[PDB]
């Protein structure tokens, strides 16, 4: 299913003026906007070609929202420092991720809103979009403030309305790229590590979206405990790369098979070292 | 389009 996400990072910096606020937006695995408060006149900027179609009023509307967030996160950072009895000399970070998952239809399938403090879960909106899960008692002070302000109700109206409507508009405006799955270009390489053991590397390249399954099989048995899997990485052209490796004793190269699962593939692939 | 209501933590 298609999704839209906004990622916020608010960081205090005791000896560099006031807190820095950064926002990035994504439609699936494609980034389309950015904002960074670290400028004299900060402005929202396009990051995908299909969003340049939006007029000046769209950019001003976004800028106004992210300027509100800069101010709001400055106070939240100060408040969280008080909950944890932290010194004003230390630098802290609040992160937030929110957004919608679209169904096969144009319906909200799942809504999200999660916050973190110093890299750990802080407060998250539950699946019902009407209640919260707080990580500790500091987060329960935030929860009490958010229940009194009815933040869960505001989010539910956003997630069920504007979030899915704007995601659908973006998917239509960028359909040639956003609604096209690029299947991986696959191949298996061979690398001797010693005289009687060689590594077999299964490659998946130029694929979009990032979601992929790469598995090695010794005669058809999941070699999951012995497989080296690298984290999916961006190619830099909006496509992704990944590889799965196995240390194989010299002679049993034809014994091992690589299995590739991706939405761009009509049927899952089965590969082996050739020749 | 981002959410335009923000509440201090």
């Amino acid at each position: 299913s298609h999704s839209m996400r906004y990622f916020y990072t608010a960081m205090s910096r005791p000896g560099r003026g006031e807190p820095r606020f950064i926002a990035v937006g994504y439609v699936d695995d494609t980034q389309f906007v950015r904002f960074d408060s670290d400028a004299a006149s900060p402005r929202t900027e396009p990051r995908a070609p299909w969003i340049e179609q939006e007029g000046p009023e769209y950019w001003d509307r976004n800028t106004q929202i992210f300027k509100t967030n800069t101010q709001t996160y400055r106070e939240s950072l100060r408040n969280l420092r008080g909950y944890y009895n932290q010194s004003e000399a230390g630098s802290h970070i609040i992160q937030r991720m929110y957004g919608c998952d679209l169904g096969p239809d144009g319906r909200l399938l799942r809504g999200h809103d999660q916050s973190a403090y110093d890299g750990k879960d802080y407060i998250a909106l539950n699946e019902d979009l009407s209640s919260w899960t707080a990580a500790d008692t500091a987060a329960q002070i935030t929860q009490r403030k958010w229940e009194a302000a009815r933040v869960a109700e505001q989010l539910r109206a956003y997630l069920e309305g504007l979030c899915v409507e704007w995601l659908r508009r973006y998917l239509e405006n960028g359909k040639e790229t956003l609604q096209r799955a690029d299947p991986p270009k696959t191949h298996v390489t061979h690398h001797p590590v010693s005289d009687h053991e060689a590594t077999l590397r299964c490659w998946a390249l130029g694929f979009y979206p990032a979601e992929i399954t790469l598995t090695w099989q010794r005669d058809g048995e999941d070699q999951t405990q012995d497989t080296e899997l690298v984290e999916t990485r961006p190619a830099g052209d909006r496509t992704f790369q990944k590889w799965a490796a196995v240390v194989v004793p010299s002679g049993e190269e034809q014994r091992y098979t690589c299995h590739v699962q991706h939405e761009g593939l009509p049927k899952p692939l089965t590969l082996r070292w050739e020749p | 389009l981002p959410f335009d209501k923000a509440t201090i933590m």
Partner: T-cell receptor, first 117, second 115 residues
Framework: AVVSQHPSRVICKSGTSVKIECRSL??????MFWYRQFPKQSLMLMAT?????????EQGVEKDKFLINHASLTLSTLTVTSAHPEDSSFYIC?????????????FGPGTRLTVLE | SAGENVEQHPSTLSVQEGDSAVIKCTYS??????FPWYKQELGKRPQLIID?????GEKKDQRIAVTLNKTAKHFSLHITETQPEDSAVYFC????????????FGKGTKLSVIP
């Protein structure tokens, strides 16, 4: 999530300056709204008080007459300078815990200002 | 706010005790997703009585209810089995429009519940 005002009633001679406070009693507010009500009971927005920024005045509001100061995250003041009998009215503020596109607003009790020659 | 205008119908309403009272509001902007209703008794502050958001068609709280038609851009307040204590000025609002953030209020409905 109450909002309060002080004073609640003012009787003053013409030419005096009258300062009115708007306080969020149990929440922090980045924005407060100042209204004026006459016998024709509609709520006339005068100005929006902004924390760390100058006030946003509505069309037809004598700026130099009504000074708005966002003092902190809980207090906003309205000052009616050199008050004259025509300035007599019911001044009421509102504030809410949500910033950005306005959400639930809680009104103060109002201030009845009576200016006499 | 620049693109939002809220209109309250009727401006004055007299109802007989025990009868129902309906106040309808219309709005113009698509960025409106929050719709509150305030009750103001003479010389007192407007008090929030009920509100509704764009993802809900109807909300009910005992004798009071609010309904929303987001396609036609109108919302209504329904008071059932009216009591003389319901006599007040009622205001509706919307949060839409561009520019400076604010609630856009209707000009009010003076409701008179005849005992």
């Amino acid at each position: 999530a109450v909002v309060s005002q002080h004073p609640s009633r003012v009787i003053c001679k013409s030419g005096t300056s009258v300062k009115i406070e708007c306080r969020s009693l149990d929440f922090q507010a980045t924005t407060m709204f100042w209204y004026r009500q006459f016998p024709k009971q509609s709520l006339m927005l005068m100005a929006t008080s902004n924390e760390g920024s100058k006030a946003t005045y509505e069309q037809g509001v004598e700026k130099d007459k009504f000074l708005i100061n966002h003092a902190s995250l809980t207090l906003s003041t309205l000052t009616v300078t050199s008050a004259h009998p025509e300035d007599s009215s019911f001044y009421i503020c509102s504030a809410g815990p949500t910033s950005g596109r306005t959400d639930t607003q809680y009104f103060g009790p109002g201030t009845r200002l009576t200016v006499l020659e | 706010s620049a693109g939002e205008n809220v209109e309250q119908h009727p401006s004055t309403l007299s109802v007989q005790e025990g009868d129902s009272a309906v106040i309808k509001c219309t709005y113009s902007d698509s960025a409106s997703n929050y719709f509150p209703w305030y009750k103001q008794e003479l010389g007192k502050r407007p008090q929030l009585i009920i509100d509704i958001r764009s993802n809900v068609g109807e909300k009910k709280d005992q004798r009071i209810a609010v309904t929303l038609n987001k396609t036609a851009k109108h919302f209504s307040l329904h008071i059932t089995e009216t009591q003389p204590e319901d006599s007040a000025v009622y205001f509706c609002a919307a949060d839409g429009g561009a520019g400076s953030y604010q609630l856009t209020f209707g000009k009010g409905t003076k409701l008179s519940v005849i005992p």
